[PDB]
Amino acid sequence: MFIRIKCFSKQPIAKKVSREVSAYLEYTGNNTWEGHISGQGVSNLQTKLINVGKGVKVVCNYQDKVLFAIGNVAMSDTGSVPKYTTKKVYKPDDSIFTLKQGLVGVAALWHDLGKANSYFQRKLRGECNPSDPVRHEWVSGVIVSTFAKGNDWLSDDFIIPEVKHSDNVFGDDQVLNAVLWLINTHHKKGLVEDPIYRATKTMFTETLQCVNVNGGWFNYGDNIDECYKIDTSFITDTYVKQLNRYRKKLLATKHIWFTLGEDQKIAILQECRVALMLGDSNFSSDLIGGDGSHLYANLDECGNLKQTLTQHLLGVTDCALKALFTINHHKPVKANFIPTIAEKGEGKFAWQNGVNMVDSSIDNMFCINMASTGKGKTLANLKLLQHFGNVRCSFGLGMVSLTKQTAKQFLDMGVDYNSAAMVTGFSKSRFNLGSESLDQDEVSVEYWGQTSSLSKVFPNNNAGFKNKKLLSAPILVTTTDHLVKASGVKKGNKQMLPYVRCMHSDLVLDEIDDYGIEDMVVLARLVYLTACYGNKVIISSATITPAISNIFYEAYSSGYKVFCANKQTTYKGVNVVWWDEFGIKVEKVTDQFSNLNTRFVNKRITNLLESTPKHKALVVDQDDNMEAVKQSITTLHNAHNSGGVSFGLIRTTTIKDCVAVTQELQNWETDLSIKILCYHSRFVGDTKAQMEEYLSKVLNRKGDEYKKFVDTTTPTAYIVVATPVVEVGRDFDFDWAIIEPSSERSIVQCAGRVLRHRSSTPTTHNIHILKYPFKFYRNSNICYDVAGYESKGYKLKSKNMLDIYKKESIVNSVNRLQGDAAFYTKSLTALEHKVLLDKLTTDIADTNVFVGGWQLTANPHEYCKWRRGTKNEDLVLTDGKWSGNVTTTKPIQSKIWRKWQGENGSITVPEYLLDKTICYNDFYGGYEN
Amino acid sequence: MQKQILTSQKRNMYILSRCKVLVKNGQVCHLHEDGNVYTVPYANTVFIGLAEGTSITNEAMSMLAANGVIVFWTKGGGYDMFAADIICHLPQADYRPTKYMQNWVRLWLDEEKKLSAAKEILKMRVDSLSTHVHDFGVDVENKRVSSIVNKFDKGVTQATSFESLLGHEGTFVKSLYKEYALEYEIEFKRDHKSADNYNKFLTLGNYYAYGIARSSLWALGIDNSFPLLHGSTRRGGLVFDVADIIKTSIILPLAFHAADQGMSNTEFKRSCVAYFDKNDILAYLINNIKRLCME
Amino acid sequence: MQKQILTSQKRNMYILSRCKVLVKNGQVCHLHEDGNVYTVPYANTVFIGLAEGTSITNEAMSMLAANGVIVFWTKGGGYDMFAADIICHLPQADYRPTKYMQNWVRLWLDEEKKLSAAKEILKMRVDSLSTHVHDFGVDVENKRVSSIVNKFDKGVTQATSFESLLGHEGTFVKSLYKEYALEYEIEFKRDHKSADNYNKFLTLGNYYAYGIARSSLWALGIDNSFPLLHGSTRRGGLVFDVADIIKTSIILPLAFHAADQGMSNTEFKRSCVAYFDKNDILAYLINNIKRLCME
Amino acid sequence: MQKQILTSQKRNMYILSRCKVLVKNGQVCHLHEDGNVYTVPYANTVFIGLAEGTSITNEAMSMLAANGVIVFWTKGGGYDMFAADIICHLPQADYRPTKYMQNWVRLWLDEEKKLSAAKEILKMRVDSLSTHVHDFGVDVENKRVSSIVNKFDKGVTQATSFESLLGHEGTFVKSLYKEYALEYEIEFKRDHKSADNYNKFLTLGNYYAYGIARSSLWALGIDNSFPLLHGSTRRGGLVFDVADIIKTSIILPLAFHAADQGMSNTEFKRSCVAYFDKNDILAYLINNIKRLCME
DNA sequence: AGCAATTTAAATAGGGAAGAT
DNA sequence: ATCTTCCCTATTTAAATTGCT
Ligand SMILES: [Mn+2]
Ligand SMILES: [Mn+2]
């Protein structure tokens, strides 16, 4: 590897970086180094070139592509190294940036006018309840609305009038309404409980007129008259001139505001709100010290009076203005040019040369990567990102362990921690034992990286470790919940960090089908927000349903419409890149996405069907599923075994179902040597982690290394009874599976856990589908709702899987890829597709995906909750002693193959099952006994 | 400027994109909106194409034309399907040598001499193929390329008109497009409006060979209004007649390799400078067009 | 600033100075020095010129060329053009050389039309002398100047060869030089190497004449390699042959007046372009070349 | 220093001549006797060498050793036929991996095991030839080279004493050196005190292979003081086996090519860097001693 | 002998203004 | 407008000296 490093630096920051860059490369003179070094040498040079201080101006070239660029060095757009560098370049009708500047400046000088009431003064001094009857943002909104109703609010002297209690402060003037919504929602968004309003309201002001004081601001309301008697000590020199210059800025630019569309207004006001909380939290974090008394805004850690309200308003204004400037004029730090990506894929990765069919100069890109598992999907996503140049992306993945797997792939192929940042925000205690030096695994949290210039506008220089890893990451391999808060939050400033993260970075969401329906709705909201700033969305899901692919394209198309009309460019359409392991297709799609997507789906189906059938599923006829499991285990051991040894996966639905199947199979008298494992999610930290590592090392069938992790000498049935934790994110390879039916994507995923690593075709049948789910004996009205898309609004007419599924069927992604809306009441696949198009629709609703008008409100974050689960309290095992109503028990010790013990950790119990003892056990975790 | 590098001996070529070209301190330099001013070696530049979002002052054209740099623009009729008017300013302030115009027009007016000259320039396609070989693509000596070159020569030998010629072009180019595509394992349809790299790199190389061909023409004084190939789809003049000598030998292998080996636009552009100066293609075309006019 | 030049009959050679040409609200405009924007009507102009201090952009270039408004880059004054493309019959629909160009070629080829056109260019040079009457210069109707004119007319009409026409042309040109020397009380002998006011002023006026003749030859698509009087090896000899028409009628009296009053070179440039704008000297050369080539 | 570049992936490579080696402002550098200070990349240097008139300091040697750069001194040869004594500072402050030294000791103390290792290391030069094939010089797979390495392998297979290994060593060195001499058409005699370029390029490559061999041995903690091949003529240590595994495969054809093309010594230094870096000869030697140690 | 702190000063870059075309 | 020349303007590099280990 031959690199060349050039320095642009002034100071002796052309000198103390010269020591480190002259420790690793030869000096060719004139502050230019050039030579041969290894990739780990590149990583060491990066780590000790960035850590040496601020102001390092370093460009590295590997062959002729830029390896890395330290700082905001413009370096190369076409040629490299400019010369007569300057300021003043373009100076356009920027319009919408002047609009955002005027809105943020006018609102930020009015965002805390409502702290001047006597209640907030005695709240800061501390002789009343610290919770206000009406929040000060609403009081400042009442001030601004009363001033606007009285005088002309855009060109007049200010003077705060006598204000009363107003239920609504939103009128008709679109720009005033924007300023009012920025003022009122500078801490939290208003929440609308009204069902008719949630049913009908769509527009900007027409929804904003329904935002009343009862949506969170009106806490208790007994001291309203003191909350609206206000002093007017803000009339000073610099506050009045700042208010005048920003109001006239808005006055001069609001003529382009009425030429915007609804989508524009929503996205622009979201940006304005994010910059306003950025400036407000930035000025509230630091201590300024000086004060002019008689009025105060915030308190220090000692509770003393600080940050008087005139200079508080001025500081929040300038900090929000500077926030806006750096978030709207940033050339963000991108990743290194990974040299182990750009070469050809060989063999089964040979489809990854589809990036040589995509244009490298497209400003936008919507990848739908429909490639099957085991083909290197995430490596292909990184290849697609690097085809357009240097990489800046957020790999948002479900589960901690899947982020760990993608991080380990990124580490061992070409990516160091100067470009990658693995973020899992829980600090799990799963450590690697055996040998620390001989590990060559366990990707960790260090991020030598490079701190971006956006950290100076965040509160108190961003944060410590976690938010520095969030914001400053070129490549952010993260759990997805660090990105879905970009679309907005209920309370606080947790929106700004993923918002500013997704503003300048691409978004790569892998296996989006494993998320929930509301989770997929907020993920497509994130896709729309990412496309709002021209970034590229890579979706990587093999079993995509047309509905999902369509609504994600429509979210990207609305976002790219926002980005196109935001830079005053005519919208040519979205560069959609359909991708699988058999080919690629790049089309400029502005309309008719459905026929092209279904034609690519049909081409992928015909490229999947002439291949040999790997998963032949038979739906059993035996009604009782206990003895159906027994007979199917006996049949698939007598048919599918490797010299007497067979691996079976009993995929069931819930935990007590799993322990019921386990306790039946343990007490089942047979000549077969059944060896039973329980693989559900309710387990203690230690025990769970141990199951994972063992299962990953015994079900690895790409080699014969497993022969030494199990007793393959004696003919044995190694059976793993598992819940849907096996069908998501597990690289497992079973000889056969017996599936309790809950949804068709569960069938396809548990087919993907059988012969995942081998290529031998089954002869007779490798999957035995149960006749009924076990909830049929508990609830015959609805049985597929647990881990399925059946529900109270979408009920199957019959629950028989002979009626709702094929008796003999080759299970692949084809049934999920096709998409059928008719006959959803008597087939599982059409039931699935129905729900997917009836929840992820092209409407705005309130919990929908095109959400417009409601982004202003708190409604999409309350009624569409990301990871909406049950109450979930956590019973914690502390050194062998349980906390709550747990009561350790003893398992049946009949056929347990492996049982790992646990002493620490915690189990997640729903509040429903907290009533009784969860009865934790070493073999199977939680049950009802 | 002393003697001034012979225009066959100029090695730098550029197609600038999204910049303001101006003169600073007597420097031909393009400035981007990020504040970066990159200079251009104007006394060594063959051509400067200007892509979308580009702009150039008067003085930059004044000291590019005094140094013999041809400046064209990639829009207007630059959609490359009609190929009608790629807006291409030449330096005619320098009074060019005349004799290549004289021998060129003596053969132009005479239609039989024009037909024979067209056949020589059609044979220059296969001459280019043999002279400029590539070690990362199609071998010229394999059975398919040798068969199609033999078919092309035996068809252009017995050719009678320019309509018969237009057809032989269809065959050579389209089937060489295809033969590469099947060896590069890609279903490929030539489309100037297509987004795949196999077409955007091909259009970039089309502009590069346009610049090389137009610089070779202007060098000798030859214009563009005297083409040898007349047809319905051959609008564009003599610059495309000179340029399609080196599509399938140079521009097409470099574009196909670039797309297959995932090069970026910048490195394909550079691979084009490396092939155009390592084998000295400008002097090749200039000397070969001297062979074409001659008497 | 904004400058209008009538060239053939109705199309106007616009000259733009100290302005930035771009596209505003969907049509080509330019911001001037005074900060006021000026649009351009597409219908009344075909040639648009970019003088000193002028920048144009890419989409403005493309939309100008798509409206038939073909652009050239010139030194400030409008008659010192260094960069353009070649006139076709239509800019978008086809690519054919202009009828004027083809007619010129045919006339040049057959020896009889070349001799007749050489006689005619000298006939119109004598016409130019009378047509463009100056105030400070000698009287064209004076007996000595009319005797020189009739001597040249007899010599051109009775000649049957080109070297006779060269001797007669040199006799007429230097006889007018001798007449203007007899006016301005000096021993004037025409040499390019002299540093006196008359010779160097005539030299840079001749360079201005070469520039305006180059613009007139370009504007009808006439190439710079078909001289009438001068030899086939003379680089750009047609520019010199066309500029000969106004060298002894316009450039010579202006240059001798300029050396007599002794003012500087830039105000001689403004006097030359003022005489070009006032009497439509370029339009005279355009109609001269049309009448020569049409025959 | 995080993860100091594994010794096998260290890339830089020098022998410093007529310069005092020092540290300025953080980095190790060398200052010649004209004021020129050239920096040494100590984090990526494999070895440095010190010729006549060189002088290294204490903290420079410390920054080389703690980073892990083996440093020797080129002069010291005083006999008539042998490269006598090269003085070499081992970085022992870095505590080395141990069991590879234990494996080397368990093969060194057993006489039949040392002979068995002597056998495989003698055919290691034979497979070095087969793997590392240059583009110039001889071809390895010709009839003469294959016949002599076949006779060498047949003789070293039936060998039973170290003196037979020394004799067969001598016939191997005479055979290769003379065949290269034949190819490059020169008369060759290996004298370390000769002014002929084929000889002092070979001594420069002796120093280069010496440095490569101590870096390979020190990377696995192997001392030079355990020579598995020993004799009266062959008394240099283990460096005179792991250094001349790669004479006739790497250095000697490179030395003959450098003495045939005949520029200065610096192209030979850079060519040794290029071939030791491109084919990863250091990592190749380390991996070969790896498959030696555990077998 | 290398370096560090710290001064001292020479020079590099840029912005504004005015004069040319 | 574009570009050049020149005057601030101070920001930015290189040398110089010298205790300190
Ligand atoms: Mn507040
Ligand atoms: Mn505040």
CA atoms within 13 A on the CB side of B131: 18
CA B148, B154, B156, B159 dihedral sign is: negative
Between CA C62 and CA B77 the distance in angstroms is 8
Q: What's at A909, amino acid-wise? A: V
**For residue A623, how far is the Cα from the chain centroid?**
42
φ/ψ region of A592 (left if φ > 0, alpha if ψ in -120 to 50, else beta) reads: left
- What is the Cα–Cα distance from A583 to A606, expressed in whole angstroms? 12
* C-alpha of A19 from chain center: 41
Buried b (16+ CB within 10 A) or exposed e, B85-109: bbbbbbbbbbbbebbbbbbbbebbe
CA gyration radius, chain D: 19
Return the HEC string of C111-150: HHHHHHHHHHHHHHHHHHHHHCCCCCCCCCCCHHHHHHHH
Interatomic distance A486 CA / E2 C1' (Å): 53
CA–CA dist C64, A190 (Å, integer): 54
Partner B contacted by A357 (CB < 8 A): yes
Inter-residue contact A674 to A668 (CB < 8 Å):
yes
For residue C77, give both structure tokens.
Answer: 């004054």
Query: What does the DSSP 8-state code read for residue A911?
Result: G
Give, rounded to a whole angstrom, the gap between the first and last alpha carbons of chain B.
32
Residue in A with minimal Cα distance to D28 = A23
Handedness of CA B143, B149, B154, B160 (dihedral sign): positive
Distance in angstroms (rounded) separating the CA atoms of residues A296 and A306? 6
Cα separation, A644 vs A11, in Å, equals 74
Distance A277 CA to ligand 1 centre (A): 9
Cα B114 to Cα B92: distance, rounded to the nearest angstrom: 26
Comparing CA positions, the residue from C105, C121, C127 lying closest to residue C241 is C121
Which member of B90, B95, B98 has the closest CB to residue C85?
Answer: B90
3+ Cβ–Cβ pairs closer than 8 Å linking C and D? no
**CB of residue A30 closer than 7 A to nucleic acid strand E?**
no
Torsions phi, psi of A714, nearest 5? -85, 135
Q: How far apart are CA A5 and CA A12, in angstroms?
A: 17
Distance, in Å, from the CA atom of A421 to the CA atom of A447, rounded to the nearest integer, reads 6
Quick count: other Cβ atoms within 10 Å of Cβ A320? 31
Matching residue, tokens 């040049």: C108
Contact A21, A29 (CB under 8 A): no
Tokens matching residue A695:
């299962």
CA dist B115 and B159 (Å) reads: 9
Q: Which residue of A has its CA nearest to B270?
A: A64
- H or E element in which residue D167 lies: helix D162-183
CB A531 within 8 A of CB A505: no
Give the C-alpha separation, C67 to C58, whole Å. 14
Return the closest-CA partner of residue A927 out of A605, A655, A678: A655
The CA distance from B70 to B212, in Å, is 9
Q: Identify the CA nearest to A60 among candidates A32, A40, A87.
A: A32
- Tokens representing A27 are 């000096």
Give the resolution to one decimal, in Å. 3.8
When CB atoms are compared, the residue of B18, B29, B186 closest to A83 is: B29
Say if CB A726 and CB A679 are below 8 A apart: yes
> 3-class secondary structure for chain C?
CCECCECCCCCEEEEECCCEEEEECCEEEEECCCCCEEECCCCCEEEEEECCCCEEEHHHHHHHHHCCCEEEEEECCCCEEEEECCCECCCCCCCCECHHHHHHHHHHHCHHHHHHHHHHHHHHHHHHHHHCCCCCCCCCCCHHHHHHHHHHHHHHHHCCCHHHHHHHHHHHHHHHHHHHHHHCCCCCCCCCCCCCHHHHHHHHHHHHHHHHHHHHHHHCCCCCCCCCCCCCCCCCHHHHHHHHHHHHHHHHHHHHHHHHHCCCHHHHHHHHHHHHHHHCHHHHHHHHHHHHHHC
A755: left (phi over 0), alpha (psi -120 to 50) or beta: left
Sheet with A537-540, strands from edge to edge, namely A420-423, A475-479, A393-397, A506-510, A537-540, A366-369, A574-580, A583-589
> In terms of Cα–Cα distance, which of A711, A759, A661, A744 is closest to A897?
A711
CB A471 within 8 A of CB A500: yes
Q: Specify the amino acid at residue D17.
A: S
SS3 state of residue D116: helix
Pick from A16, A25, A44: CB nearest D3: A44
- What pairs with residue D23 in β-bridges? D28
List CB contacts of C20: < 8 A, sequence separation 6 or more. Answer: C30, C31, C54, C55
The residue length of chain D stands at 295
Q: Are C59 and B51 in contact (CB under 8 A)?
A: no
Non-local CB neighbours of A282 within 8 Å, separated by 6+ positions: A319, A320, A323, A457, A458, A459, A460
The answer for residues whose C-beta is within 8 angstroms of residue A812's C-beta and 6 or more apart is A608, A613, A614, A615, A748, A751
Contacts of A29 by beta carbon, 8 Å cutoff, 6+ apart:
none
Beta bridge partners of A394: A476, A507
Determine how β-strand A574-580 pairs with β-strand A366-369. parallel
Check the annotation: does A504 bind a ligand: no
D195 φ, ψ to 5°? -85, -5
- Give dist(CA A17, CA A31) in Å, integer: 11
Q: Specify whether the CB–CB gap between A183 and A137 falls below 8 A.
A: yes
Q: How many CB atoms lie within 10 A of CB C31?
A: 15
Angstrom distance (rounded) from CA D293 to CA D222: 11
Q: Say which amino acid occupies A281.
A: S
H-only helix segments in A335-414: 377-387, 400-413
Smallest Cα distance from A235 to chain D, Å = 57
Provide the terminal-to-terminal Cα distance of chain D, rounded to the nearest Å.
34
Q: Are strands B27-31 and C70-75 parallel, antiparallel or unpaired?
A: unpaired
User: In the structure encoding, which two tokens stand for residue A107, read together?
Assistant: 């609102």
Q: In what order do the strands lie in the sheet with D37-39?
A: D37-39, D27-32, D19-24, D55-56
Burial (CB count <10 Å: 0-12, 13-18, 19+), residue B221: buried
Question: What is the experimental method?
Answer: cryo-EM
Amino acid at D63: M
Are D43 and A23 a contacting pair at CB < 8 A? yes
Q: Check if the beta carbon of residue C285 is closer than 8 Å to that of residue C246.
A: yes
Return the residue matching tokens 């230097």.
C174
**End-to-end CA gap in chain A:** 64
Residue B210 · residue B277 · CB < 8 Å: no
A763 part of contact set with chain D, CB < 8 Å: no
What DSSP string runs through D186-213? ------TT--SHHHHHHHHHHHHHHHHH
Write out the two tokens for A679. Answer: 């693989």
Nucleotide with smallest C1' distance to residue C18 CA: F1
Find out whether A104 and A324 touch, Cβ atoms under 8 Å.
yes
Determine the distance between A321 (CA) and E6 (C1') in angstroms.
39
Burial of A611 (0-12, 13-18, 19+ CB in 10 A): exposed
Reference D16, options D43, D42, D47, D44; nearest CA is D47
Cα–Cα distance between A601 and C184 in angstroms, integer?
A: 92
Helix (H, G, I), strand (E, B) or coil at B44: coil
**Torsions phi, psi of B61, nearest 5?**
-65, -30
Shortest alpha-carbon distance between residue D117 and chain A (Å) = 29
Instruction: Indicate yes or no: strand F within 7 A of the C-beta of A16.
Output: no
Strand order in the sheet with C70-75: B12-16, B45-50, B70-76, B86-91, C80-84, C70-75, C45-50, C12-16
Q: Which residue has the tokens 């002439």?
A: A610
Packed helices A96-108 and A262-285: angle between N→C axes, nearest 10 degrees: 50
Closest among A697, A690, A633 to A661, alpha carbons compared: A633
Closest in B25, B197, B270 to A360, CB measured: B197
Q: Tokens 């030089």 correspond to what residue?
A: C177
**Cα dihedral B212/B218/B220/B221 (nearest 10):** 160
Q: Which long-range contacts (CB under 8 A, 24 or more apart) does A608-611 make?
A: A608/A812, A608/A813, A608/A814, A609/A814
Q: What share of chain D is helix, strand, coil (3-state, %, to 5)?
A: 50, 10, 40
- The reply to whether residue C95 touches residue B225, judged by beta carbons under 8 angstroms, is yes
Which ranges in A286-359 belong to alpha helices (H)? 309-328
The 10 Å Cβ neighbour count of residue B41 is: 15
**How far is D159 from D139, CA to CA, in rounded Å?**
28
Phi, psi at A314, each rounded to 5°:
-65, -40
- B265 contacts on A by Cβ (under 8 Å): 360-361
**A112 annotated as belonging to a binding site for a ligand:** yes
Cβ contact C48:C14 at 8 Å: yes
DSSP tag of A732: -
Interval between CA A851 and ligand 1 midpoint (Å): 27
Task: Collapse the DSSP code of A889 into the 3-class scheme (helix H, G, I; strand E, B; otherwise coil) and give the result.
Answer: strand
Measured CA to CA, the distance from residue B243 to residue B228 in angstroms comes to 12
Residue pair A445/A422 in contact (Cβ under 8 Å)? The answer is yes
For residue D131, how many other CB atoms are within 10 A of its CB? 11
Any strand F atom closer than 7 Å to C20 CB = yes
Exposure class string for A361-388: b at 16+ Cβ within 10 A, else e: ebebbbbbbbbbeebbbbbbbbbbbbbb
User: Where does A745-863 show beta strands of DSSP type E?
Assistant: 767-769, 808-810
Residues of D in contact with A27 (CB under 8 A): 38-39
> Three-state SS for D16?
strand
- Taking a C-beta distance cutoff of 8 angstroms, is the pair A756, A666 a contact? no
Question: For C79, what's the count of Cα atoms within 13 Å in the CB-facing half-sphere?
Answer: 31
Cα A442–A445–A448 angle (5° rounding)?
A: 120
CB A741 within 8 Å of CB A784: yes
Q: Find the farthest-apart pair of alpha carbons in chain B and give their distance in angstroms, rounded.
A: 59
Burial of residue A806 (number of CB atoms within 10 Å: 0-12, 13-18, 19+): middle
Q: Which whole-number Å values give the CA distances from A9 to A23, A224, B171, in the listed order?
A: 18, 59, 57
Is residue A596 within 8 angstroms of chain B, CB to CB? Answer: no
The token duo for D261 is 């093309």
- Cα first-last separation, chain C: 38
